[PDB]
Scaffold this active site. Structure first.
Site, short mmCIF file in Angstrom:
data_model
loop_
_atom_site.label_atom_id
_atom_site.label_comp_id
_atom_site.label_asym_id
_atom_site.label_seq_id
_atom_site.Cartn_x
_atom_site.Cartn_y
_atom_site.Cartn_z
N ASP A 52 0.85 -1.18 0.00
CA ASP A 52 0.00 0.00 0.00
C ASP A 52 0.89 1.25 0.00
O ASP A 52 1.91 1.31 0.74
CB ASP A 52 -0.83 0.06 1.28
CG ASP A 52 -1.91 -1.00 1.35
OD1 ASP A 52 -2.27 -1.61 0.34
OD2 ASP A 52 -2.43 -1.21 2.47
N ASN A 59 -3.34 0.19 -2.95
CA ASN A 59 -2.61 -1.05 -3.11
C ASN A 59 -2.19 -1.37 -4.53
O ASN A 59 -2.81 -0.99 -5.53
CB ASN A 59 -3.33 -2.26 -2.47
CG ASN A 59 -4.40 -2.84 -3.35
OD1 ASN A 59 -4.12 -3.41 -4.43
ND2 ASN A 59 -5.63 -2.67 -2.94
#
Ligand SMILES: [Cl-]
Ligand SMILES: [Cl-]
Ligand SMILES: [Cl-]
Ligand SMILES: [Cl-]
Ligand SMILES: [Cl-]
Ligand SMILES: [Cl-]
Ligand SMILES: [Cl-]
Ligand SMILES: [Cl-]
Ligand SMILES: [Cl-]
Ligand SMILES: [Cl-]
Ligand code: NA
Length: 129
Positions: A52, A59
């Site tokens: 992330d 992500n």
């Protein structure tokens, strides 16, 4: 860049997040607080091997390319490093696509677990917006 709370609220608002997909500005500020602590350089590996990136912890499984997430896509058409910039434009453009994907802000687990249903207006209190 570590944004101040009101500083981030103002930038998110300018970029059209307030009420985007029906989510008020405080939702977005709350999500950024718990995702990144308002730090554009935040990165966190996930158990699945994705990572992330950035203030909204976008992500690499679906949204950006980092070259090290097998089988993943790049639906925001950006290198994940672009999500670490001082300038939040890329992160906001990508977040708009994520929150449009079907589950709204539930895509951000921290939003669901820490912001959803709470007094999210508090996150914009005091701000001259
Ligand atoms: Cl709000
Ligand atoms: Cl925390
Ligand atoms: Cl980092
Ligand atoms: Cl990764
Ligand atoms: Cl981000
Ligand atoms: Cl990859
Ligand atoms: Cl690596
Ligand atoms: Cl791949
Ligand atoms: Cl950013
Ligand atoms: Cl929704
Ligand atoms: Na990817």
């Amino acid at each position: 860049k570590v944004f101040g709370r009101c500083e981030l609220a103002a930038a998110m608002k300018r970029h059209g997040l307030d009420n985007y997909r029906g989510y008020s500005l405080g939702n977005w500020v709350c999500a950024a607080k718990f995702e990144s602590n308002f730090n554009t350089q935040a990165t966190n590996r996930n158990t699945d091997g994705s990572t992330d990136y950035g203030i909204l912890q976008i992500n690499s499984r679906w949204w950006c390319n980092d070259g090290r997430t097998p089988g993943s896509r790049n639906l925001c058409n950006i290198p994940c490093s672009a999500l670490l910039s001082s300038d939040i434009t890329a992160s906001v453009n990508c977040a708009k696509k994520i929150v449009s994907d079907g589950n709204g802000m539930n895509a951000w687990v921290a939003w669901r677990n820490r912001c959803k249903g709470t007094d999210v207006q508090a996150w914009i209190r005091g701000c001259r917006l």
